[PDB]
Amino acid sequence: RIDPSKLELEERLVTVNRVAKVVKGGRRFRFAALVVVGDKNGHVGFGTGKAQEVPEAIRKAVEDAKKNLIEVPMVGTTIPHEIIGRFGAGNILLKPASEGTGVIAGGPVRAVLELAGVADILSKSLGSNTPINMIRATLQGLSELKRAEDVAKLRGKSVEELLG
RNA sequence: GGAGAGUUUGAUCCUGGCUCAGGACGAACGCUGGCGGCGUGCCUAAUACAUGCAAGUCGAGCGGACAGAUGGGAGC
């Protein structure tokens, strides 16, 4: 479901772009921030915010990021299975890793996976490197993940009839 | 066992090349320089080389030699 946002959230930002609109007078600027928000227990989200200022943009981005939250399975502090998330010419593979590796990821992917609470990720972006579409690609790859308990419940099966 | 970033625009998303962050040398150059261990050290002209050595040995295969004096005598 929609994750109700009443938690403690850490809310760090990826980028603020300076973003123009041409009028009869000339260029009129705004600041478009996108901020990733989530506790490190499995709830992530991100949001965009636009204003004339930097801090109001970060305000609106943190609000819209708290609105849309997603869940991620944290099976053994990793992800359950390797997946490619592909939101619109941003394609990012995610492998589970062993317990020592640390989050191996680039900047906004690293922000999603650190604010997810997932600790051991092999990952790589195989597409364009805008932060917005890469964050959408990561959360596409984390929405399509599957729990072994839930897939065992899906196949009319038991967990040990899957895991061995 | 797998990290990306800058740059086409007034602003943006893609495509797209270019550029960077890494590890390596039989490396060289520049600045600098303490030792020890272990390794390596003409990549070029298979260009030309003074000098010194780098393949000799067996007298239990052989003939002749050179010394040598165990005793033997020789001239003062």
Swiss-Prot record:
GO terms for cellular component: cytosolic small ribosomal subunit. Pfam families: Ribosomal_S5, Ribosomal_S5_C. SUPFAM superfamilies: dsRNA-binding domain-like, Ribosomal protein S5 domain 2-like. Keywords: Antibiotic resistance, Ribonucleoprotein, Ribosomal protein, RNA-binding, rRNA-binding. Changing K24I: In BSPC 111; spectinomycin resistant. One of its GO terms (biological process) is translation. Changing G26V: In rpsE1; spectinomycin restistant, not a ram mutant. It comes from the Bacteria. GO terms for molecular function: rRNA binding; structural constituent of ribosome. Part of the 30S ribosomal subunit. Contacts proteins S4 and S8. With S4 and S12 plays an important role in translational accuracy; many suppressors of streptomycin-dependent mutants of protein S12 are found in this protein, some but not all of which decrease translational accuracy (ram, ribosomal ambiguity mutations). The N-terminal domain interacts with the head of the 30S subunit; the C-terminal domain interacts with the body and contacts protein S4. The interaction surface between S4 and S5 is involved in control of translational fidelity. Altered S5 proteins have been identified in a number of mutants. Some mutations in S5 have been shown to increase translational error frequencies. This is Small ribosomal subunit protein uS5. It comes from Bacillus subtilis (strain 168). The gene is rpsE.
